[PDB]
Amino acid sequence: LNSSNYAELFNNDIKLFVDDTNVYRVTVHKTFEGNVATKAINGCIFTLNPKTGHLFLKIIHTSVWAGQKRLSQLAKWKTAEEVSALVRSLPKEEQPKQIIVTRKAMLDPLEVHMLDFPNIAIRPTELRLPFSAAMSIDKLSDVVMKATEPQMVLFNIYDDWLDRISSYTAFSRLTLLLRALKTNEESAKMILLSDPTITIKSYHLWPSFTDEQWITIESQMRDLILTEYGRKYNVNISALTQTEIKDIILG
Amino acid sequence: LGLLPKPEPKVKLSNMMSVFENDQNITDPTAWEKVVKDQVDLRKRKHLEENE
Amino acid sequence: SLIPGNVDLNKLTEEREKLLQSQIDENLRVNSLSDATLEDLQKMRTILKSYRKADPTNPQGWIASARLEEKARKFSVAKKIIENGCQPRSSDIWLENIRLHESDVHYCKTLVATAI
Amino acid sequence: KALPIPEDQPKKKRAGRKFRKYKEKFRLSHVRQLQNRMEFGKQEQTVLDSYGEEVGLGMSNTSLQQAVGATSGSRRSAGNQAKLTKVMKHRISEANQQADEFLISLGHN
RNA sequence: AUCCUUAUGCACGGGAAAUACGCAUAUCAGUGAGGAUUCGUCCGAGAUUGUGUUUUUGCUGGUU
Numbered sequence: 001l002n003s004s005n006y007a008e009l010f011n012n013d014i015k016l017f018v019d020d021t022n023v024y025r026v027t028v029h030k031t032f033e034g035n036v037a038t039k040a041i042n043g044c045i046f047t048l049n050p051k052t053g054h055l056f057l058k059i060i061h062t063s064v065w066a067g068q069k070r071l072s073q074l075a076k077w078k079t080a081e082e083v084s085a086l087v088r089s090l091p092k093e094e095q096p097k098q099i100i101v102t103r104k105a106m107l108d109p110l111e112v113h114m115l116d117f118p119n120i121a122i123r124p125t126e127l128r129l130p131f132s133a134a135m136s137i138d139k140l141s142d143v144v145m146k147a148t149e150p151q152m153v154l155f156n157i158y159d160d161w162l163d164r165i166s167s168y169t170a171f172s173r174l175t176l177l178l179r180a181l182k183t184n185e186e187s188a189k190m191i192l193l194s195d196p197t198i199t200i201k202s203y204h205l206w207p208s209f210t211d212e213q214w215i216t217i218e219s220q221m222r223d224l225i226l227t228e229y230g231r232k233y234n235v236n237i238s239a240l241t242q243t244e245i246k247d248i249i250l251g
Numbered sequence: 252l253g254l255l256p257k258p259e260p261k262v263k264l265s266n267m268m269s270v271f272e273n274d275q276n277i278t279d280p281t282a283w284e285k286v287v288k289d290q291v292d293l294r295k296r297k298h299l300e301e302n303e
Numbered sequence: 304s305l306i307p308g309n310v311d312l313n314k315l316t317e318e319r320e321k322l323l324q325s326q327i328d329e330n331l332r333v334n335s336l337s338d339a340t341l342e343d344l345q346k347m348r349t350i351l352k353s354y355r356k357a358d359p360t361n362p363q364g365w366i367a368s369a370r371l372e373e374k375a376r377k378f379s380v381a382k383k384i385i386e387n388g389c390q391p392r393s394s395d396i397w398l399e400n401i402r403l404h405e406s407d408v409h410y411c412k413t414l415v416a417t418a419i
Numbered sequence: 420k421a422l423p424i425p426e427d428q429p430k431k432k433r434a435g436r437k438f439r440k441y442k443e444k445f446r447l448s449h450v451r452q453l454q455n456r457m458e459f460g461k462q463e464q465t466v467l468d469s470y471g472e473e474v475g476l477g478m479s480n481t482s483l484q485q486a487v488g489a490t491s492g493s494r495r496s497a498g499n500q501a502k503l504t505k506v507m508k509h510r511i512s513e514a515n516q517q518a519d520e521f522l523i524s525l526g527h528n
Numbered sequence: 529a530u531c532c533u534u535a536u537g538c539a540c541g542g543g544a545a546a547u548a549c550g551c552a553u554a555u556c557a558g559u560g561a562g563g564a565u566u567c568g569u570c571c572g573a574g575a576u577u578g579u580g581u582u583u584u585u586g587c588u589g590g591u592u
């Protein structure tokens with residue numbers, strides 16, 4: 001996947017994204033003896049397809065890692081196993097074709113479980129996909145942090161944007177949200193929540209709006225990424241071309 | 252000869268994604284929804300107008 | 304469609320004849336292919352070994368190393384692995400082991416005494 | 420009638436949605452390019468042709484698909500697919516249509 | 529006044545094809561072109577001939 005390959009995501013080909021960066025996590029602590037301590041919490045693999053805005057989250061339980069050493073490699077194979085499970089649950093109507101993964105570390109271990117489905121193709125990306133930051137979503141993280149077992153939970157990431165809007169822009173906004181939740185995290189959260197009159201229902205993730213609320217919000221969300229990237233790398237925002245910005249946004 | 256405007260591309264909700272004409276494609280996602288969706292209706296409105 | 308690898312007739316007739324029947328109702332591996340090179344097979348083995356090492360438990364990766372190996376080669380190799388990873392709880396390993404390994408009745412019986 | 424000239428003419432480009440769809444016939448697709456890759460220091464997968472001459476299909480399978488000899492569906496490009504000429508296209512349909520009439524006769528008779 | 533049918537013209541929207549589309553101070557051609565046949569008869573408009581372009585016609589945009 002490139003900046004020149006981006007459009008080919010949205011053809012009628014059924015697709016999946018699988019990104020494992022959030023599978024095994026660590027919490028810094030400070031021991032009572034007394035130095036730094038390290039505890040793992042739940043591992044979730046985020047697998048989602050842009051056309052229908054559907055998630056499949058496998059919530060990796062902490063006890064999954066309890067008795068095993070070299071937990072670096074084990075997680076990848078676990079993820080692969082989960083992915084193999086995922087497709088065999090979908091009938092050949094719903095089975096994908098291009099499964100796509102960001103980490104190149106996942107290409108080999110998938111293929112070993114993906115032999116039974118020779119039709120399915122696997123890609124790596126030169127595009128860093130901000131589904132690592134998807135744990136900044138509260139409702140998800142809540143369900144995840146409260147989860148007592150390895151499980152499966154469907155969601156609709158696009159809320160009801162699809163009713164009102166084609167899935168391409170529906171997914172393009174979702175970048176700006178997630179690209180901006182890698183960046184200045186909660187300080188970016190406040191861009192959404194300025195109005196308490198704007199309510200997140202029990203169903204949804206992103207709060208409901210009008211169209212022109214998003215039109216302005218997207219401008220704000222767009223700004224951070226331009227300021228932080230320049231600021232970190234000491235580059236003025238004003239210089240960049242239309243093209244240039246787009247690449248920054250994508251990663 | 253330059254008596255007439257150079258034509259800009261037609262755009263649709265199909266063609267929408269892969270037109271990288273310099274105007275706010277990925278940058279403003281919902282601002283580019285409106286332009287095309289507005290654009291589509293303006294063409295149609297013309298069909299209706301020629302009729303009436 | 305023309306790369307020569309794919310065609311199996313039995314899929315082909317079953318896939319078709321059915322279609323023909325439907326139409327009527329509405330109206331109303333390859334033997335050519337060279338066997339696995341030793342170098343390439345070696346690649347597979349390493350990956351499966353890595354998987355096995357990654358989990359000493361989870362026999363799901365154990366039967367795969369038996370089954371994937373079995374299709375490619377089988378015989379001496381797989382039958383030794385299915386015995387090795389057998390080492391009690393999983394039923395699946397036991398089920399796998401008897402079928403490949405057994406040929407002979409005494410041995411089958413002995414294998415059965417394992418799961419039981 | 421006279422050969423045009425051998426002088427070259429600057430290359431012109433276009434490509435839309437429409438012109439990509441036509442050209443797709445005349446380019447070696449992705450899957451078909453991987454047959455031109457020959458992976459060095461090891462023997463090609465070959466399958467013998469009807470004729471029996473072996474057809475090397477080079478990297479077209481992944482090294483884990485060789486060892487299990489799965490073969491790969493991969494991604495099949497529908498665009499090249501062969502399709503009938505204009506002349507020929509109606510001669511089939513016309514033959515078919517006329518044939519249906521024939522069958523009915525025997526149906527009623 | 530509504531409604532309905534066929535032809536032709538401009539036109540939004542959806543498809544398919546470019547081994548296809550034409551052109552001729554040029555030969556014939558329902559005063560029968562070119563085919564089918566169960567052998568009793570049945571369909572009825574183009575066929576020759578020379579030629580132009582045909583993995584492309586015009587037009588923009590990116591990146592070097």
Ligand SMILES: *OP(=O)(O)OP(=O)(O)OC[C@H]1O[C@@H](N2CN(C)c3c2[nH]c(N(C)C)nc3=O)[C@H](O)[C@@H]1O
Nearest residue numbers: 298299300301302303529530531532533534535536
């Ligand atoms: O639409 P408009 O009233 O302008 O029509 P005109 O003013 O041009 O005038 C006379 C013609 O009216 C049509 N009408 C009108 N009505 C009510 C009517 C007509 N014709 C019929 N038939 C002939 C069946 N029935 C009616 O009830 C006629 O064309 C008159 O010429």
